[PDB]
Amino acid sequence: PCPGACVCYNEPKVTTSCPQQGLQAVPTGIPASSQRIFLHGNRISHVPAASFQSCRNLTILWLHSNALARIDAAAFTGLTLLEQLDLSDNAQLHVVDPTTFHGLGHLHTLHLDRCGLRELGPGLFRGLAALQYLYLQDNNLQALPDNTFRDLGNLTHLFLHGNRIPSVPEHAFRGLHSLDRLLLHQNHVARVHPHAFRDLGRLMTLYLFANNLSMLPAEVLMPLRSLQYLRLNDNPWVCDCRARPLWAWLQKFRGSSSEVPCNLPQRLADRDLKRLAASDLEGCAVASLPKCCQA
C-alpha cells in the first residue's frame, strides 16, 4: 500500500507523492510500480543505497529542497529508465561520489543547482550519453577539469553560472558537440584557453559576463560558427592593442552582443569596444604582458 502520509495514484503515471510532510528519511515501502517519486520539501538528510531499488520503472525522482548531506554511491544503481533526477536546493550536500550517476543511460535532465558542490570529480558524468540538460549553477566550483563532460554528446544546455571558476582549460568542454546554450557568467574567469570552444560549433548562446576577463583572444570565439547571442559585459576589458583581434571578430559578428565595456584606459571608460574605431586601440594601456605591449 501507500506509505506514511504519501499520496499514491496511477494516472497519468504511477506516482508516489510525499512532499512537505516533515520527512527526516526516505520512506520505506515505496510501491515497486512507482514511475514517479516526489520527495521534495522535506528534511531528508541521507539517501541510503536501498532507497529506490524496488522501483524498476522509475523515470522521475525529485529530492530538491531537503537537507541532504550525503548520498550513498549506490543510491541510483540499476535505475536504468531514470530520465529526471533532481537534487537541487540542498546547499549542504557539498560532495557527490564520482560513481553516483554511473549506469544512468536514459537520464535526460540532472538538477544539481544550489548544492554547495565543491568540485566535479573524475568520471562524475561518465556514460550519460542521453543527458540534455545539466544544471550546475550556484554551487562552489573552483575548477573545470579537462574531459569533465566528454561523454555528453547530446547535452544542449549547460548552466555553470554563480560559481568561482577561475579559468577555462583547453579540453573542459571537449565532446559537447550538441551544446546550444553555455552559461558561464558570475564566475572568476580570468582566462580562456585559445581552443577551449573547439567542439562548440553548434553553440547559439554564450554568457561570460560578470567575470575577470581583461582580454580574450579572437581564437577563443572563432569556432563558434553558430553563435547568435554573446554576453561579455561586466568584465575589466583593457581596450588597447591587445583588444584588436577581439575587436575585429566583433566587427564581423552577425548575432547579438552585449556591451563590451572598456575598463582601461580611462579616456575610453565604459565605452563599447565593439563601437570603437580601430585607431582608438593603438598603444599599450599598461606599458603576463601581451605581445603588442612588448614590441
Ligand X SMILES: *[C@@H]1O[C@H](CO)[C@@H](O)[C@H](O)[C@H]1NC(C)=O
Q: How far is CA 42 from CA 27, 67, 68, in A?
A: 11, 8, 10
Q: Which is nearer to ligand X, 129 or 292 (CB)?
A: 129
Q: Residues of 15-39 as b/e, b for ≥16 C-beta within 10 angstroms?
A: bbbbeeeebeebbeebbeebbbbbb
Q: Partners of 8 in the beta sheet?
A: 16
Binding site for ligand X (CB under 6 A): 32-33, 56-57, 129-130, 154, 188, 190, 212
Closest approach of ligand X to the CB of residue 178, in Å: 7
Q: Partners of 182 in the beta sheet?
A: 158, 206
Q: Which is nearer to ligand X, 76 or 280 (CB)?
A: 76
Q: Residues of 63-76 as b/e, b for ≥16 C-beta within 10 angstroms?
A: bbbbebebbeebbb
Q: Which is nearer to ligand X, 17 or 33 (CB)?
A: 33
Q: Can you read off the three cell numbers belonging to residue 86?
A: 533532481
Output the CA angle 134-137-141, nearest 5 degrees.
Answer: 105
Closest approach of ligand X to the CB of residue 154, in Å: 4
Closest approach of ligand X to the CB of residue 126, in Å: 13
| Alpha helices by DSSP H, the chain | 218-221, 244-252
Count, residues in the chain: 295
Closest approach of ligand X to the CB of residue 282, in Å: 24
Q: Which is nearer to ligand X, 56 or 118 (CB)?
A: 56
Q: Can you read off the three cell numbers belonging to residue 283?
A: 598603444
For residues 62 and 64, what is the distance between their CA atoms, to the nearest angstrom?
Answer: 6
Three-state secondary structure call for residue 248: helix
Q: Which is nearer to ligand X, 98 or 127 (CB)?
A: 127
Closest approach of ligand X to the CB of residue 162, in Å: 15
Closest approach of ligand X to the CB of residue 164, in Å: 10
Q: Which is nearer to ligand X, 115 or 246 (CB)?
A: 246
Q: Which is nearer to ligand X, 32 or 49 (CB)?
A: 32
Closest approach of ligand X to the CB of residue 129, in Å: 4
